[PDB]
Design a protein around this nucleic acid. Structure first.
Length: 90
RNA sequence: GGCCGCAUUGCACCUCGCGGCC
């Protein structure tokens, strides 16, 4: 099982949504959990449907993951895990 | 810049699947 990390990894995201909008919408629902350093969403073949939300505190990430797990975002239940590895900005 | 089709459920941190229309 994935250990806690201050970055959460989200997938099963609706790929039809433009990346800039996607990120603003994500910030709309995750900022309640604590300070966000950055949100990474790419639309490459490999990385579309996915995003990284990088919290300042690990406890924010844990709370965000547990609370928002499965929340239907642009119609699709978000799938949320901790990221495998630390995000670069540190 | 705007539409749309095919394929993709994928762990990233300098681009970066393919095709059609305006």
């Amino acid at each position: 099982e994935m250990l806690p990390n201050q970055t959460i990894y989200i997938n099963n995201l609706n790929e039809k949504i433009k990346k800039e909008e996607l990120k603003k919408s994500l910030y709309a629902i995750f900022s309640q959990f604590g300070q966000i350093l950055d949100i990474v969403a790419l639309k490459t073949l490999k990385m579309r449907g996915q995003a990284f939300v990088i919290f300042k505190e690990i406890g924010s990430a844990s709370n965000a993951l547990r609370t928002m797990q499965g929340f239907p975002f642009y119609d699709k239940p978000m799938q949320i895990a901790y990221s495998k590895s630390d995000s670069d900005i540190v």
